[PDB]
Amino acid sequence: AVQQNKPTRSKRGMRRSHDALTAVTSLSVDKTSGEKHLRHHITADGYYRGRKVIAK
């Protein structure tokens, strides 16, 4: 049926509680002193130190 009821104020537009983010930490580790992710060594070429998948 048609929307014959109240606007999105307080009790609705308030609802943010469990819609939240995941507050991720991260390791500085200069083995990859730029292109690294959270603890995930490189977001692309799959390097660690020498020859692995397609790195070096």
């Binding site: 819609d19 983010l21 995941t22 507050a23 991720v24 930490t25 991260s26 992710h37 959270l38």
Partner: protein
């Protein structure tokens, strides 16, 4: 205040764009990218590239410390106005919006 490089205009609504601003208040300028690039949304990536535009300027433009500029508020505004159509009833509804956004970063110092 110091620096305010907001970006225009996105495709998203201000609701999805606003969902992340609070995280970066006060205590995250030193290492800002990790929470934003590893939460890889067209909101967080936008607040990333905002922050980046704002603070790559600040250290040059004033002479301040790039590590003491405390990223103090980050709010958003819409607008002006944009429309498009999809003829679902072709005499009534039919009329999708872009409310759009521009991220009023406001960075400041400790």
């Amino acid at each position: 205040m110091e620096t305010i490089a907001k970006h225009r205009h996105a495709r998203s609504s201000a609701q999805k764009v606003r969902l992340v601003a609070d995280l970066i208040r006060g205590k995250k300028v030193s290492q800002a990218l990790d929470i934003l690039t590893y939460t890889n949304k067209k909101a967080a990536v936008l607040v990333k590239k905002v922050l980046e535009s704002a603070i790559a300027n600040a250290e040059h433009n004033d002479g301040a410390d790039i590590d003491d500029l405390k990223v103090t508020k980050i709010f958003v505004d819409e607008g002006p106005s944009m429309k498009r159509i999809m003829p679902r009833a072709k005499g009534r509804a039919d009329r999708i919006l872009k409310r759009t956004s521009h991220i009023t970063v406001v960075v400041s110092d400790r």
